[PDB]
């Protein structure tokens, strides 16, 4: 009868458990001690956490069950508005936006953008390149620069030059504030209490930089009139097949902010997640590095070459089975279903997928799930379907998986040739959590294997 | 009948009107009223300033006159030690320095520093390059960001990477506070009062920094032996020819401390000036770009090229001209001896050579004088003697004039090159005084010219 659930406290039931800034950790801790799934009640509020491939393959079934808003995105919606990432499926402009981006976001959409992500990709080689002997690397932080400038650059032909700062550009300084903001919210439960109020006048600050911003570009684009290889581009002559209408410019601006949000934080965690596992298993290295240099024999890496580095691929994927940067999503129930023959849901009765969790089950990885080991994915077709969602589910899953894995590949593989590297603080794994996994204060030192550019 | 003088204090005496932030601009000031030749006279001291070709040709005169260190220097002298800047010409380690360092800053030696200097040259074209329309660019900051990376690149062979940066390395930043600090000293009422006490604390702080990566870079060079083509190598392997003893360790991080220091200011501040009388003359500019584009034919400027770069080099000099950015220089009477046939000087007596006076000669250069015009230094032979001195004179004449000029040069020729400029904001000339002079808050704007690299 009664699904498993953890320590309650009082009026306010299981809520306190996420007063701490590793939520996704305590939850992966929780789930491990009460099983495939347990139910989480705060004042007003119920949801189920799935952990288990078996209820999360149903769960997975777009039939039955449709993306849910979760606090955090709802939150996150005050600034990225109806945009993709924070639209409600039956809302007209997720469909419109869908089918005008998906082509702008397919695997053969990427040799546009490439020669721009090499251009970035470039500028990291040459930061690590100029260092001097006892500097390090502060991996995460870099990893940022290079993803939020990529995104920019590919997305709106907008440079960031987050290389040629220590305070990031304005925007981005906005971003990070909103998203601490949002994601703080979940943890308090007293709205307007007079010291959150200056919270909010930073809040309204940060929103407006962002408008004002996006929205300078959009105009200065349509008034110039000119072409290029970047989403906005496509964003204002696309129209949408079925309705036959194009994005208006507010939309435009959410789906630019969006793409800042979305894809930034998550690639740049993959990219240092895929590192320190890296550094922490050196057969794995050698191999991955071995590919980078037998396959990348040109100075400036081609599309094609990016394609064949076949395990810097895996490497990848490993890294985001044990640490998915975007550890879960919220699902609802469609209309009143059993799940796994044995748990009743209502309408409307909300789901959260642990993804770690998912990637930890015994049943589809086996006795080793702790152990890095990108072999697992030697051959794709091997895994079973919805044992593996680092970019989620279906029609809502991430329209910028061929962007995000295009980028990574490219970068590490840039990295492996360029540069050999060294664990010298011996970095203990602490992972931060904001919207996003990062591993916190890791850091590297790179030795240049002297190749040019 | 004897000697002018401006306005006195009563017991003060002239003192206090070096008490504001731009001394040397009230000193031309007061050329202007009192003409050829003031005194200046402070509480238990006493100097001359001199400002005619007439008057300091004699000056000029080696055996009469020697280089005095200024209370400026002797300030400077407190991290610059006994460096080729801040030591007397009868210090053994002057002459040695001198003999063991000339071979090292010849107009040959440029050839081995070309390709360094051109590495930063290329950092800062593709920063403005990277820039975004309605961005601007500051000149003096970039400048500095340039001069400083290549003089510590070329001189031993430490990226001090200012363009990855807002905030300058713990090093410049340190020197900077340190010259700050140094220069203020000339106007105070009594260095021993317990509101400088943390200046005190920060000054010596200063300083270590300094030291210690310095004494470290040439300890590091030391045990590994890497053989560069920098200052460094130069002072570790080289003996003076007269006594047959090299530089100690001490006395080398003297040097590469006084080349960071006499070279990065300067340098910038004569880009700066340069760049600044060009927009304002759109003709001049014009030329120098149309020279530009003819010479510079290759996507790396070679060391000949550089040298062909004749109009170029005309405006370096007409900059220098009108705001030479080492405005001063301080000497004193080897013995008794009478100056111009009217003013008798005893031994030990101080003159002080205000260039930028000099440099407003009328009866040197004509009426003209307060005009940008390249031209006068169409045939350099017509120049009188001691009548253009930017560099200084004689023996303790400026070491790296010939790294200054290839260097500005350079960069300079590359700028014409690769940008139209803007002077976006009709700046209104604004000089700032520390050891050097510069057009504070001088910005524009560059329009790409879109020639590849
Ligand atoms: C390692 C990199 C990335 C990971 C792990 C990741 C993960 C995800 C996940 C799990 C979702 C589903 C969220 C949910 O169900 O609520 C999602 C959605 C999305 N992602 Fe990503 N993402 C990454 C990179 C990117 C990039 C680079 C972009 C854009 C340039 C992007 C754009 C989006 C968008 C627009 C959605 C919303 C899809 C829709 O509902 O139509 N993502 N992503
Ligand atoms: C626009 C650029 C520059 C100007 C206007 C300039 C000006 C001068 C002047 C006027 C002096 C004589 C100082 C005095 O008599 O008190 C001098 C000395 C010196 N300068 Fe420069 N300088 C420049 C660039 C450089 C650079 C780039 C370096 C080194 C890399 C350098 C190193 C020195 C040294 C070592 C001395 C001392 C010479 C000695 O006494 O042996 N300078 N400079
Ligand atoms: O925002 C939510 O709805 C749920 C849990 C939650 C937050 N507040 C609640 C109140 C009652 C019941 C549940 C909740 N949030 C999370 O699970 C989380 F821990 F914040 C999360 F995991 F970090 C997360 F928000 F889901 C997430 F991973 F950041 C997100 F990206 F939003 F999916
Ligand atoms: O340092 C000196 O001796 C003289 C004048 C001076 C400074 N303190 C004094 C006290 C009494 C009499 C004269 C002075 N200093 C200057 O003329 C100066 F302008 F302040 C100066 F800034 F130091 C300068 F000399 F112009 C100079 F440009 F900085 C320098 F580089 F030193 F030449």
Same mark, same amino acid.
């Given at each position: 009868?009664?699904?498993?659930?953890?320590?309650?406290?009082?009026?306010?039931?299981?809520?306190?458990?996420?007063?701490?800034?590793?939520?996704?950790?305590?939850?992966?801790?929780?789930?491990?001690?009460?099983?495939?799934?347990?139910?989480?009640?705060?004042?007003?509020? #119920?949801?189920?956490?799935?952990?288990?491939?078996?209820?999360?393959?149903?769960?997975?079934?777009? &039939?039955?069950? $449709?993306?849910?808003?979760?606090?955090?995105?709802?939150? *996150?919606?005050?600034?990225?508005?109806?945009?993709?990432?924070?639209?409600?499926?039956?809302?007209?402009?997720?469909?419109?936006?869908?089918?005008?981006?998906?082509?702008?976001? &397919?695997?053969?959409? /990427?040799?546009?953008?490439?020669?721009?992500? =090499? %251009?970035?990709? *470039?500028?990291?080689?040459?930061?690590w390149?100029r260092l001097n002997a006892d500097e390090h690397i502060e991996?995460?932080?870099? /990893?940022?620069?290079?993803?939020?400038?990529?995104?920019?650059?590919?997305?709106?032909?907008?440079?960031?030059?987050?290389?040629?700062?220590?305070?990031?550009?304005?925007?981005?300084? &906005?971003?990070?504030?909103?998203? %601490?903001?949002?994601?703080?919210?979940?943890?308090?439960?007293?709205?307007? %209490?007079?010291?959150?109020?200056?919270?909010?006048?930073?809040?309204?600050?940060?929103?407006?930089?962002?408008?004002?911003? #996006?929205?300078?570009?959009?105009?200065?684009?349509?008034?110039?009139?000119?072409?290029?290889?970047?989403?906005?581009?496509?964003?204002?002559?696309?129209?949408?097949?079925?309705?036959?209408?194009?994005?208006?410019?507010?939309?435009?601006?959410?789906?630019? @902010?969006?793409?800042?949000?979305?894809?930034?934080?998550?690639?740049?965690?993959?990219?240092?997640?895929?590192?320190?596992?890296? =550094?922490?298993?050196?057969?794995?290295?050698?191999?991955?590095?071995?590919?980078?240099?037998?396959?990348?024999?040109?100075? *400036?890496?081609?599309?094609?070459? =990016?394609?064949?580095?076949?395990?810097?691929? /895996? *490497?990848?994927?490993?890294?985001?089975?044990?640490?998915?940067?975007?550890?879960?999503? &919220?699902?609802?129930?469609?209309? $009143?279903? =059993?799940?796994?023959?044995?748990?009743?849901?209502?309408?409307?009765?909300?789901? /959260? #997928?642990? @993804?770690?969790?998912?990637?930890? $089950?015994?049943? @589809?990885?086996?006795?080793?799930?702790?152990?890095?080991?990108?072999?697992?994915?030697?051959?794709?077709?091997? @895994?079973?379907?919805?044992?593996?969602?680092?970019?989620?589910?279906?029609?809502?899953?991430?329209?910028?998986?061929?962007?995000?894995?295009?980028?990574?590949?490219? #970068?590490?593989?840039?990295?492996?040739?360029?540069?050999?590297f060294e664990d010298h603080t011996?970095?203990?794994? %602490?992972?931060?959590?904001?919207?996003?996994?990062?591993?916190?204060?890791?850091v590297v030192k790179a030795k240049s294997?002297?190749?040019?550019?």
């Amino acid at each position: 009868k009664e699904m498993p659930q953890p320590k309650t406290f009082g009026e306010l039931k299981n809520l306190p458990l996420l007063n701490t800034d590793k939520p996704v950790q305590a939850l992966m801790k929780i789930a491990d001690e009460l099983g495939e799934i347990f139910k989480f009640e705060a004042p007003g509020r #119920v949801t189920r956490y799935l952990s288990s491939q078996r209820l999360i393959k149903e769960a997975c079934d777009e &039939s039955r069950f $449709d993306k849910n808003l979760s606090q955090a995105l709802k939150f *996150v919606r005050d600034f990225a508005g109806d945009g993709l990432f924070t639209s409600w499926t039956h809302e007209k402009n997720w469909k419109k936006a869908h089918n005008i981006l998906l082509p702008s976001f &397919s695997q053969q959409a /990427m040799k546009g953008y490439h020669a721009m992500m =090499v %251009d970035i990709a *470039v500028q990291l080689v040459q930061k690590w390149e100029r260092l001097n002997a006892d500097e390090h690397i502060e991996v995460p932080e870099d /990893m940022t620069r290079l993803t939020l400038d990529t995104i920019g650059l590919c997305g709106f032909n907008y440079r960031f030059n987050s290389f040629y700062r220590d305070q990031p550009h304005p925007f981005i300084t &906005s971003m990070v504030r909103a998203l %601490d903001e949002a994601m703080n919210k979940l943890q308090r439960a007293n709205p307007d %209490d007079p010291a959150y109020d200056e919270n909010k006048r930073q809040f309204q600050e940060d929103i407006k930089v962002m408008n004002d911003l #996006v929205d300078k570009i959009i105009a200065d684009r349509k008034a110039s009139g000119e072409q290029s290889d970047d989403l906005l581009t496509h964003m204002l002559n696309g129209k949408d097949p079925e309705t036959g209408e194009p994005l208006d410019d507010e939309n435009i601006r959410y789906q630019i @902010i969006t793409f800042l949000i979305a894809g930034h934080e998550t690639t740049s965690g993959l990219l240092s997640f895929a590192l320190y596992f890296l =550094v922490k298993n050196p057969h794995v290295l050698q191999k991955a590095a071995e590919e980078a240099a037998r396959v990348l024999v040109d100075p *400036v890496p081609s599309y094609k070459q =990016v394609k064949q580095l076949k395990y810097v691929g /895996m *490497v990848l994927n490993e890294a985001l089975r044990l640490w998915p940067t975007a550890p879960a999503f &919220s699902l609802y129930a469609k209309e $009143d279903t =059993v799940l796994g023959g044995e748990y009743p849901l209502e309408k409307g009765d909300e789901l /959260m #997928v642990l @993804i770690p969790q998912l990637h930890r $089950d015994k049943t @589809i990885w086996g006795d080793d799930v702790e152990e890095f080991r990108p072999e697992r994915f030697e051959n794709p077709s091997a @895994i079973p379907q919805h044992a593996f969602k680092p970019f989620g589910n279906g029609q809502r899953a991430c329209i910028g998986q061929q962007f995000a894995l295009h980028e990574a590949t490219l #970068v590490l593989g840039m990295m492996l040739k360029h540069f050999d590297f060294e664990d010298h603080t011996n970095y203990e794994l %602490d992972i931060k959590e904001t919207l996003t996994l990062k591993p916190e204060g890791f850091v590297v030192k790179a030795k240049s294997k002297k190749i040019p550019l």
